[PDB]
Amino acid sequence: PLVTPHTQCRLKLLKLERIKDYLLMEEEFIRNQEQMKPLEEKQEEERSKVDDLRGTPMSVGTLEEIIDDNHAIVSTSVGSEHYVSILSFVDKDLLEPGCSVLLNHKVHAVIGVLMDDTDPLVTVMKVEKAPQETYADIGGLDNQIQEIKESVELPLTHPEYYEEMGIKPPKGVILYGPPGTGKTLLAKAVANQTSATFLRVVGSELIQKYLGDGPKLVRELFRVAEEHAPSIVFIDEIDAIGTKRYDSNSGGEREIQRTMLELLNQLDGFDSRGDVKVIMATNRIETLDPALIRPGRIDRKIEFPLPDEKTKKRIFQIHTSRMTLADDVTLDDLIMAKDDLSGADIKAICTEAGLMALRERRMKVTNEDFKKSKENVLYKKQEGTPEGLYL
């Protein structure tokens, strides 16, 4: 992530060709690795007959009980239960009733044991790519940047400060405020610069219709996070997961309400938690369940207000990084004159003014682009609130 000239300079032509040099050599070295292998023994006769000892259509079974005389009991998908033996090379030390095993068809015998057993709905929510830029991307939020770093990055990088006072770091963080402020950016910048793994949850993702399929996916969600790295979990748009826990008349409302009541249990209920951090985000905060807002579950409440006349300069500066800017413009024209508008408004102004230059056959962008752009973006919010009663 070092393309730091950020412009059409020969350094970025030199830097990226260095990256081309190392990856081509990494290709050619592993190309030589699968090339110059004159070693063939292929099992030394042991695993080769074993791979022929097991059946070729390997099937999947489920343990019920363990009769340890090398003759145990299993269960199939339909529930057909078979007094099968243990055809060998399996240590009887990691097989428990519930752990799924590997079976045959002709004799149904236990050949291996199936590992990791993840239902392929939680593996979709496992992020592999760092999407965007680092903390230097966003346009100045440094009082609240230092807050989230105290609970996520700093306890993982340097947990020597906390043992000197015996204080565990905070676990839950709420991001709340008006829309268009930077909630989704602050999660993506953390997921960029991190060392542990990352999990994203899009709102109504853990909602199904089979009346028990809802809460069952939540158990496997925290199970995967606990079994893997000391990592964090980002669950966004939790306004569709909690509203004050009232009792009413609809029957599909309860399997909604029950799944959202056992997330409470997995979070800060019985004995332990592990090193799992949870980051949650909404637009509205007052319509939430007060059982989730209490400390023990969430220890940080972070406001994201609409910007000022000072850090707004940093918003216009970053979104006008790589565009040809004519020297006629003043950034403080649109900032000081109008004092209401979000950070997502400013990105729309910079894109619209660039479209106005091609609209009148230009490359550079003058003040007259921003005069028409600041109009056209802002005409989507209504006229006003009350007449001159107050003075």
């Binding site: 829309p179 709102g203 306004d239 909604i256 637009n283």
Partner: protein, 50 residues
């Protein structure tokens, strides 16, 4: 987004939050464009109008 209680609707919002997020979530999409067309400008929600 109305209130809770036995009023408004949750499930209308449950679908709406996914529309609110598959184009603006953790993963930004490319080469997919949406067109929305309706009257009654002031009564659709101020989270997809941003």
């Amino acid at each position: 987004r109305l209130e809770g209680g036995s009023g408004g609707d949750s499930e209308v919002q449950r679908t709406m939050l996914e529309l609110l997020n598959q184009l603006d979530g953790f993963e930004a999409t490319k080469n997919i464009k949406v067109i929305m067309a309706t009257n009654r400008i002031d009564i659709l929600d101020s989270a997809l109008l941003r």
